Design a binder for this molecule. Sequence first.
Ligand SMILES: CP(=O)(O)OC1CCCCC1
Ligand SMILES: CP(=O)(O)OC1CCCCC1
Ligand SMILES: [Co+2]
Ligand SMILES: [Co+2]
Ligand SMILES: [Co+2]
Lengths: 327, 322
Amino acid sequence: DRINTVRGPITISEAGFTLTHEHICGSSAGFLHAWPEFFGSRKALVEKAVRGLRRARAAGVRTIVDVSTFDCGRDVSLLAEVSRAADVHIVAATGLWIDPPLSMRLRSVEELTQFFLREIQYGIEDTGIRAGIIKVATTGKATPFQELVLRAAARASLATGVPVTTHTAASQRDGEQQAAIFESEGLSPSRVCIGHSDDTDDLSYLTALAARGYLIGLDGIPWSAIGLEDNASASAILGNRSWQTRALLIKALIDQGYMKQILVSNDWTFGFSSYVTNIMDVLDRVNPDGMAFIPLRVIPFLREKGVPQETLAGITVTNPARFLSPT
Amino acid sequence: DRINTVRGPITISEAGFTLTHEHICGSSAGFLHAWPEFFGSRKALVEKAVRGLRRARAAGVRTIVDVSTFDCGRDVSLLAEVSRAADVHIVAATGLWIDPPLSMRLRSVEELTQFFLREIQYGIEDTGIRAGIIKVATTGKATPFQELVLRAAARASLATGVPVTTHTAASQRDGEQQAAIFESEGLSPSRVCIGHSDDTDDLSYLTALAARGYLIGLDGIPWSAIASASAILGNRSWQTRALLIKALIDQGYMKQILVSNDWTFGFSSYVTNIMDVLDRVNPDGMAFIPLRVIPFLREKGVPQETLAGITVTNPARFLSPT
Ligand SMILES: CP(=O)(O)OC1CCCCC1
Ligand SMILES: CP(=O)(O)OC1CCCCC1
Ligand SMILES: [Co+2]
Ligand SMILES: [Co+2]
Ligand SMILES: [Co+2]
């Protein structure tokens, strides 16, 4: 009984192969409840999620960390239903993403701390499901509110031992400002993952954060718009860098002695409403493997390039276990 | 069985004294469900709402129209519970307010029309409760998205007969631009209420819209401040806001007037403890219209039959699906 999942507490050894940054549904607070027909039906979304997670389990995945926050449309009852049906452990998140409502954005650092602590210690909504990770975000220079969220996340982490994971605009080196704010609150770098770090080729930025003890989130490996770059909306979110380029950053960080600081994921989803219509159809064509992309296509790629089996197992099993474990 | 309420359909006769622009709780989508301790507890908010609605009922109110939209934190199950315990009919709303999320603000006019139609024709969430009004908003010159919302609201109204009610920045005269968009869509002015119209003293703006067939929403009479409270309430007294009703009755537009309090029992979409400030400014709550505004208008010479026309007849005709 170490890490909290949507099905209850599980031991560290039960976690196994873990994908540290995933989503079942990328939405907005209350959206799925009010407009399930946007995703066909709630039933259709569940079935797609169950099929995808089952295919991921068949490939080796045993646990995923759903980093969807309140404002990213997190529906823990959906997470619970799909987790049980697919028999894959799902770790839920607290925190705030890039779209907080008025009721969240007018809150003080003390109130935000209480909200995060409530979702970790008491439970999310009336479900009794407790969060096992805190998700925060910046998109360039932090706004006065985003600073309060980072500080509240740090205080929530210090009181519970629960890790913090971030969304960054990696090209703008956001991880450095986030790191500075986290450390001013006394939070240990070993409890933080600087996410979306594969969105940049700046190895100097990645190694420096890794040297300080930060976990590096190389979480969007299948995101590439190569071939279909005519669609401005798809190119803006996927990027023009290949999956191989993003995957070679895993090799680059190992080669420099930071294998213990790497966390790999797909940043996949089965539903996506917080972007243009039919983006889900575009995503499923680019990567038909879904969450199964890491064990099926990335792990054999790194094995072909010379990376040993034990360090890859250490990246996919040992690093997430050490990160998610409350300390 | 024509007007949809949170407890099912009711007739025109059952509506009675109706407050056309009210809120049980002003929040954000999913907020009350995720953080009920912010309001003390869900039980505390329900109890405050029931006592508040019972006070309005004892003062003569039979129906209130909760204009809280999806993004304004509307929880129809809460509206259903408080309606039951207080024996006051509550009409739920669809539409979008000033805080739409990414999943709403990236939608086309066709998709927003489908959403509004869903809430009116099928039901809200999984409750089976259908909306009886469409709420929309502009805060000055309409943003490209706000134009899309106004058009989708008109299309949803034209397909159902359900009325449209608006939130305006009355000092910037949004009602004229809202009117132009509604008319371009083919929406009849008699199906539209230009709300927050009592935030301005410009009578020429109100009478011109009323002459075109629009309903004028003089809905924030208790909102007066005579830090962050002064920015939302304003430096104008309730008597000045109430005299605008008489000024419109005199200009011959008693049939175009809709009066309300724009009150709430929970408010999370603003600064903390804003409720303690509001409850001291107006301890009458939703009962402010029949207890303070109606006797004030009676004192100024306005007959009981035109006041009964404004509070009973006008809302029934407005809410009736046509
Ligand atoms: C900008 P980010 O990729 O973290 O958010 C998205 C939410 C919907 C699923 C894909 C991810
Ligand atoms: C500016 P608006 O009329 O939406 O103010 C409302 C006050 C009551 C809570 C919901 C907001
Ligand atoms: Co993500
Ligand atoms: Co308003
Ligand atoms: Co209002």
